[PDB]
Amino acid sequence: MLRVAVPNKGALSEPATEILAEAGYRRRTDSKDLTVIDPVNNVEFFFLRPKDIAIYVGSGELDFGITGRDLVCDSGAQVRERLALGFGSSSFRYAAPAGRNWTTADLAGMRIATAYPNLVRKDLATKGIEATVIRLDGAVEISVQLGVADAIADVVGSGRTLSQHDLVAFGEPLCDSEAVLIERAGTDGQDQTEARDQLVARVQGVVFGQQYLMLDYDCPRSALKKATAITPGLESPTIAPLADPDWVAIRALVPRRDVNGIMDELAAIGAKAILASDIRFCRF
Amino acid sequence: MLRVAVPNKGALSEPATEILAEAGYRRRTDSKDLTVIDPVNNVEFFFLRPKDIAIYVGSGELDFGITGRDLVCDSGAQVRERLALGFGSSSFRYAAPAGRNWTTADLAGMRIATAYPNLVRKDLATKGIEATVIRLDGAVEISVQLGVADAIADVVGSGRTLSQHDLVAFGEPLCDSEAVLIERAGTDGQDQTEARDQLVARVQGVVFGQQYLMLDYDCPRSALKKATAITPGLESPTIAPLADPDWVAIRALVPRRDVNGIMDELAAIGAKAILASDIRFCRF
Amino acid sequence: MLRVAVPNKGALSEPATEILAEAGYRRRTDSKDLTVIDPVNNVEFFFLRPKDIAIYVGSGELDFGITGRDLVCDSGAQVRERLALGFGSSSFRYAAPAGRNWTTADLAGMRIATAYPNLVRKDLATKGIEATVIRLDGAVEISVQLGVADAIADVVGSGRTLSQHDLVAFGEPLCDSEAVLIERAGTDGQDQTEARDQLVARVQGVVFGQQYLMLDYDCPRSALKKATAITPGLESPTIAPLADPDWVAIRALVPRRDVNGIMDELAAIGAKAILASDIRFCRF
Amino acid sequence: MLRVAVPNKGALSEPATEILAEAGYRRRTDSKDLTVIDPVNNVEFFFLRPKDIAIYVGSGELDFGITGRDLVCDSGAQVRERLALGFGSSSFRYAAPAGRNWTTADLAGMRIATAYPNLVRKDLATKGIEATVIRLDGAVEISVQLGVADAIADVVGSGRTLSQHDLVAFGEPLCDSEAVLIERAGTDGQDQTEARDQLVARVQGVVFGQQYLMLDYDCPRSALKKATAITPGLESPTIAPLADPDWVAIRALVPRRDVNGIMDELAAIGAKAILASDIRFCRF
Amino acid sequence: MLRVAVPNKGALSEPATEILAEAGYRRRTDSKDLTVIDPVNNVEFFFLRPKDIAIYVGSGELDFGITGRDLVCDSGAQVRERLALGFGSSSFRYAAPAGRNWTTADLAGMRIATAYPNLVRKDLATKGIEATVIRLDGAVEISVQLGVADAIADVVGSGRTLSQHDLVAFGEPLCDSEAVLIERAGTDGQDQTEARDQLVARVQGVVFGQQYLMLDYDCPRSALKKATAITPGLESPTIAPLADPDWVAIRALVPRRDVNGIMDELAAIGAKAILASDIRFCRF
Amino acid sequence: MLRVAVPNKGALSEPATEILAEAGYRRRTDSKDLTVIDPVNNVEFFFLRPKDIAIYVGSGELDFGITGRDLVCDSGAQVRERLALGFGSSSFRYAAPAGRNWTTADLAGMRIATAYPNLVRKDLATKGIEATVIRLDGAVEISVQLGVADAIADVVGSGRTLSQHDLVAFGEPLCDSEAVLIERAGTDGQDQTEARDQLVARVQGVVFGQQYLMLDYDCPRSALKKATAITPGLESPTIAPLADPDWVAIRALVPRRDVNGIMDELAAIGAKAILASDIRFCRF
Ligand SMILES: N[C@@H](Cc1cccs1)C(=O)O
Ligand SMILES: N[C@@H](Cc1cccs1)C(=O)O
Ligand SMILES: N[C@@H](Cc1cccs1)C(=O)O
Ligand SMILES: N[C@@H](Cc1cccs1)C(=O)O
Ligand SMILES: N[C@@H](Cc1cccs1)C(=O)O
Ligand SMILES: N[C@@H](Cc1cccs1)C(=O)O
């Protein structure tokens, strides 16, 4: 029996449930209750505060959790990062009032406000800089105008929040906010390592599969050799006859980021009825 | 022209609309209005109180409805149950205050509170027990603490509601709450039996299809005979060549409940890029 | 870099975002913010008032927009209508109090209230009729009871709003409300015509694809010739062997509106496990 | 320690809590939890389904409840109606399809649908009429169009629901829906009758007080005798000097329904700065 | 029977209903339905689109309405403004991109976007300036960035919307947005002028009363002459004895804007227990 | 110009705004924006995270804030507590799994989870106990079941959260959660101490006033001496004649907690029409 922590609120909550459903796990009946038991797969899901999930995996009885990479950095927990999940990512920056030409060495001896004080203290220490790091609960950008800090450190999305408070980012970026699957650092026994590997393999099937689309298209046999070079697939394109003996249908996986270039090439050699559909799971 | 009753509220409402959409019927424009007309399919949908749907089908002009099995038991209506739909299911139990070792024969001469008094009276009568059944509108669990009843009878989900009021279930379970497609018990004419059968066949396509996934995978020709035995499909696996002449692609339906065992077997004999995707409709 | 206007509210807003996602464009992170930048595809999306989108495309810097056809008629903007999108459609009618036998020539010299005064004035002028057209902001049906107009002109959905105010429609219908992709009437340069055509082709892939389903079914080789005539596909049916040498699997696109007739024919000649699945994109 | 049932939902819920607050009882912290304990006043409040409150008072351990008069009629409970509360009132009528000249004797042998079957059966029996009364859970007006009943019986607010389904009311009105304070029919002991009377007196202070306004106005001593006859107050007007020796200020309770006529009379005899303010509690 | 138009949505809707309730009119049962009938006071209330209310009063059958002053300016309706209501007020300004030193004469021949085109055209014409005024449905501030206009004209609240789009206001302010009670310009008959005056007098009682507070305080008789000069009241302070013969209690209306200065003066001469309470109605 | 921090969310937010409105300060226009400027009173209000308000007052530029007493204890800020506000109060307890007879000395060397780690560490240190205090973001009660802690420390409301997780409180209570007005520990200048004192006096007027009701009643002159002893008021009862020379009206403040006992005594000596009304402000 495995126990998995899922964010119960915020930007990571819906895509975390979506990726667990695509891996075949029982979805949450309604947002009211806070555990979901999966008797088929032998897993229990707990819906917890996002900033706490790393502590529950690192110090508690949870085998796995989904949370942001910056929250793992800030927590001090000793856990394994098994997979980057492909959502929630955003840079983490220092920032200070615009029009002042701020640089990293200006931070020495200043007051820096953040919701991630352990992350920031470790970053400054590696760069050999000492400063006063002030813990806040959230929404730190207003703290400069209000006189609590000289500068801030926060997740920056597209700069809306920095711009709306006349702040500009500077310095090297810190630990980012991409969603990750984390695992407790342990060994336990043999009959537990197997059950753990099964979950990682299933989540990995979604993480990998979601990078591709299936192309299906009708192709003249005369353009077949060209078509095969344009869509070589993960192993090799599938080729099946049509009723019309001068034609075939071809099936091949293609990366989502390549799809529009690929289709233009196929049209130019005679391909017709080019279909593209989402992949939600693929065990390579 | 057919008339179909759909629950307008509660746990059955969204999955009932979802199953009707997957059968190809026009979905509700917005939750405000309470009828949807489908000119293409020649069907009108009425969104009604769930506890009333069995009476509208049994005594009214509706040909079909979707409702819970326990609500059909409680209604006294004479209707046909054509399909179990695969959602909404939960046990229906007697319960009484914890720590008292309650048994079914303890009910004789007691006061029993329930929102389903006809269901409970028929159940007691079959077991040869007489008691005072008190009709309540809902949320019956608090009625013991408040002195209206000695015991209750209700849908139990996972026991959250029983536990939160210090109640424990006992006795044989009663008529459960699984969602069902019900039909009016009739004959009408010939030109009406045909239109009725068409709807049942389409809903059945969803009920059956939703139990499977399509597996698509690349396989070495040397492991082909093993692969065929692992995924025999509904009739027989589809086999198509790849461009690489030492390989094929195989397509076969597999039950959702078997999928993870199946994939492990395929990987161990050489299969690569194992894809799995939802089936939403299949006419066997 | 292209700029595209999307309705931010109302009946057109969700299906407009859905069609842009199926064409492969980055979906809106949350309904709070009002621009979404797509660095991959090199497009910026602006979420604007629906009644204003035609003016932003016609007079502003936007290359494209999605809006209702009646709003383009009312705006006076000079834009190209490139695609009808297949949603949001509804008739646009004159209406007047029930039980009075109203005809178009009764409008001469009357007061007509509408939220689309330019559309109505142009319609009357073409028919050679003069009247006083009163601009209102919305919900015009109550304006007769309240004495501001003798008749109205409005989008009629199914007549709920007309019926609920005792109004009946008359006369030839006006410019309807179907959703359309509009483009700025221009030429600009060469490197801009190409980027524009790419977007139209991708949206067209969704508009075309969404009219079909993929049928997949197992078929005896003895019924193969009949099967090919029943599902001829967009080019020609795909045919692949099963493991069982007396059988094949057939794949063919079929129009959604034909699907249930088609499947009945296939069952009657021996076809088994008839699958149907949505198409979300097809470049013909 | 007293126990009081308050509707947890619907049209009676907010004004019931408002009247209990004005009587000085602790208000509900938030709509989530379902009991509120008042240690000061020694009362516990339970927030229950409105249709069940009469059964909890009549058969359970609750001393008091607030509910509709029609729900008491339908419940069959033996409880005392102590106060009419002055809100929630509406007529209860039979109704049948418009344009048919329906009368009470037309009900004999017909099918009548209602959410209050015990109320309706008792009403028919008193009039010497037999019919088939069909219990429905709610929203009964659509049941005629759908073929379950020939006529209905329901609370009619202003006829919106009857009109929107082409129904017209007929016959003598039944038990109405005015909110009432009900009490368990009992005697218990001496130390319980006292605590019960205290609550009734406090609620009665609100019910009585809310029928009046306090008038405060400056008046010339020459118009004093006229003023006293216009506002005689509950006992006699209060009269106090102003600094200016030719003037006084007068205070008197006046019924809300009389206030505007009263003020016009006072202005016409010289009164100035006529103030009116709500009364929320008055023990006569 | 009078008919009154109330905004059904937006910033004016709640304070408009609040002022009508304090004048003693029946409040809206729930936001669903769109008329409220007051049989006691013989008035019917219609809840309409705010931008349309001036047209319903000016051209329709409504006797009164509550709307913004700028909406009356933009409508072209001929109505009487009877009372300024004391809420909703905000300036109406031209604005253009920051850092450009814009002045009113820069508008000549430019494109100006606004939701109030008739208001703006009349303002420009009075100043002897010609320009192209572009009607938009709302949210006009983004129209400069998007290339539809050179400048805008809009209600400015505190400049949040101008600042968030890098716009700065210039020129003389236009017709503002303060809420007003408007009346149809007419004469009708005698028995209608009376009913109209009654409503204006009652609303005026709230508009006037809401500018004051009632002060009630205990005062030594030795400081009485000073106290009378500090709070002279609307006519003259009320003076009543306390039980203690060296003391009195004084009651006087004071303007809300003066209250804190007044109380400081009273404390310094010996006044104790200084009470202040809201006035909701006063007929002077 | 003063700056005041108000909680923007949670249980303290609405009563904090209510108490500031009753002191005469401008209320927040809508929950969207996060500052409100009061030009009349010369105060700016900032709506901030509750757990941060003590840091903004202690280290920032804010003169005042409203927050919980436990949050001041946990923050380490050096601020003055000027007033207890009379809402939000609740005990703060240690707790551990039920049925184990837990005592304070059992905490030594254990793991204790809390959202208020500084408060808990200082409490343990004063009692001479060492333990491992684990910071969590919220909802700490589940942390025992999940293996992160042996015991917890949290605000307990009525024990719902402890009971729902099978925890029981033990030991002496810690710093509680009552709402307080806090002030920055400073001196600044002379012209700033005055403006600060004015705000404290106005909030104190609400805190004091809200503990009383005004009684107004008609009394026979023969029962006057008894009446004066029953309601002596804050200074002495107000006495005014009625028109009827055998009667007077009496006005006196009485504590809310005494009111029902007082009224019973007044009725028994002949008092009639006993009115009671809320006090929202009183400067003693
Ligand atoms: N044969 C193609 C498509 C696939 C069929 C089955 C799995 S992948 C490929 O390898 O990409
Ligand atoms: N031939 C495979 C897969 C299918 C293709 C078409 C329908 S089912 C089977 O029977 O399971
Ligand atoms: N060959 C079939 C099905 C398709 C396969 C690939 C594209 S369309 C057809 O043309 O309809
Ligand atoms: N004396 C007046 C007003 C009141 C003063 C106190 C109670 S009622 C009356 O009897 O109406
Ligand atoms: N006599 C005082 C207070 C009032 C008593 C009644 C009306 S106004 C004044 O004129 O202000
Ligand atoms: N004179 C009474 C009532 C009051 C009148 C004015 C202030 S307090 C008292 O001191 O309680």
Residue numbers in the entry:
A (entry chain A), B (entry chain A), C (entry chain A), D (entry chain A), E (entry chain A), F (entry chain A): 1 to 284
Reproduce text from the manuscript describing this model.
Many of these FL-regulated enzymes present in pathogenic bacteria, such as the ATP-PRT from Mycobacterium tuberculosis, are essential and have been proposed as attractive targets for antibacterial drug discovery. Because of the common FL fold and functional similarity, the regulatory domain of ATP-PRT has also been associated with the aspartate kinase, chorismate mutase and TyrA (ACT) superfamily. Activation and inhibition of ATP-PRT leads to the same overall conformational tightening of the hexamer. Our data suggest that there is not direct correlation between R- and T-states and active and inactive conformations in ATP-PRT.
In contrast to most screens employed to date, CoSPI identifies molecules that are only active in the presence of a regulator-enzyme complex. This strategy led us to the discovery of 3-(2-Thienyl-l-alanine) (TIH) as a non-essential activator of M. tuberculosis ATP-PRT. As expected on the basis of the overall structural similarity between the two ligands and the results of the competition kinetics experiments, TIH was found to bind in the same allosteric site as l-His, a site defined by opposite and complementing surfaces of two adjacent regulatory FL-like domains. We confirmed the identity of TIH by calculating the anomalous scattering difference map for a data set of the complex collected at 1.8 Å, which exhibited positive density for the sulphur in the thiophenyl moiety and allowed unambiguous assignment of the correct orientation of the ring. Side chains of the residues directly interacting with the ligand assume identical conformations in the two complexes with the only exception of D216. In the ATP-PRT/l-His complex D216 interacts with the l-His side chain via a water molecule-mediated H-bond to ND1, but in the complex with TIH the water molecule is missing and its position occupied by one of two observed conformations for the D216 side chain which is oriented towards the thiophenyl ring. The other noticeable structural difference in the allosteric binding site is the absence in the TIH complex of the H-bond observed between HE2 of l-His and the carbonyl oxygen of A273. The comparison between the structures of both the monomer and the crystallographic hexamer revealed that the l-His inhibited and the TIH activated complexes are highly superimposable and share the same tense (T) conformation so far attributed to the inactive state of the enzyme. The crystallographic structures at 1.8 Å of the ATP-PRT/TIH complex obtained from different crystallization conditions consistently showed the hexamer in a T-state. Addition of either l-His or TIH shifted the equilibrium towards shorter drift times (44.1 and 44.2 ms, respectively), characteristic of the T-state.
